[PDB]
Amino acid sequence: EKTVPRLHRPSLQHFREQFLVPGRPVILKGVADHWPCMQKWSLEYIQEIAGCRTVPVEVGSRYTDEEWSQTLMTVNEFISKYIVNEPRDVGYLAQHQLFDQIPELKQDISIPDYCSLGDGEEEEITINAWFGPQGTISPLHQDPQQNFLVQVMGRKYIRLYSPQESGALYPHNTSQVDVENPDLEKFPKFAKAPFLSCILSPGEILFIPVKYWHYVRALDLSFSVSFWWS
């Protein structure tokens, strides 16, 4: 497939002019790979620091509002039931501001310098945790802000469609199409829609331009951190 480009610590100017302004995706290397989270986060570290904390957990496909659901449980309960022993069902600790809830963890991360290129102020950047077993899947969708998706534990497969291709994406903000199991009959335009893809690995940051369409499956036990900014 066509792969998202990878750059080691590109200047602020180059990032702005070649990716930010024109809305082109890119993977940034050498930027987050030495944040303390990269060496510190593990099942055991997370359980030790945050195991007792209460967090929202998704179960089900996020294609339709009616198709998924969240329940509150401790981090230990979530790891026990959905990661370790020995998951029948798929649970995802997704889209949760864990780092406002647990300021100890926020110390293990950092706000990417590139964020200073936007209009908004730093305090207004939304930082979400995405913590889950191999096999979690976020259906194709778009978000209203710029995004730096930081991979911390494990790898994700990520597929990206320009907003220029919204039409071939048979929306309902979220696509009706199962990106990895599409129905060629029900949505013909899809299969020839062009895209970029990647396997996002620890230390790596994917820049997802505002409104850019993205699909995401965790290949391993996974932990990512997104920064929604403007």
Ligand X SMILES: O=C(O)CCC(=O)C(=O)O
Query: Across the beta sheet with 126-132, what order do the strands follow?
Result: 6-8, 26-29, 205-208, 146-153, 222-229, 126-132, 91-96, 54-60, 68-74
Q: What is the residue whose two structure tokens read 């002019």?
A: 17
Residue 138 interacting with ligand X (CB under 6 A): yes
Is 229 known to sit in a ligand binding site?
no
Question: For residues 175 and 224, which CB has a smaller minimum distance to ligand X in the complex?
Answer: 224
Strand partners, 175: 171
Is 35 known to sit in a ligand binding site?
no
Binding partner of residue 74 among Ni ion, ligand X, a second copy, none, CB cut-off 5 to 8 Å per kind = a second copy
Question: For residues 27 and 149, which CB has a smaller minimum distance to ligand X in the complex?
Answer: 149
Exactly one of 17, 44, 48, 124 binds a second copy (CB under 8 A); which one? 48
Number of residues in contact with a second copy under rule CB under 8 A: 10
b/e burial code for range 57-67 (CB count within 10 A of at least 16 → b): bbeeebbeeee
Question: For residues 142 and 154, which CB has a smaller minimum distance to Ni ion in the complex?
Answer: 142
Exactly one of 4, 98, 129, 149 binds ligand X (CB under 6 A); which one? 149
- Residues 6 or more apart whose Cβ sits within 8 Å of residue 130: 92, 93, 94, 95, 136, 222, 223, 224, 225, 226
Residues that bind ligand X (CB under 6 A): 130, 136, 138, 143, 147, 149, 214, 216, 224, 226
Q: Catalog residues that contact a second copy under the rule CB under 8 A.
A: 48-53, 74, 76, 103-104
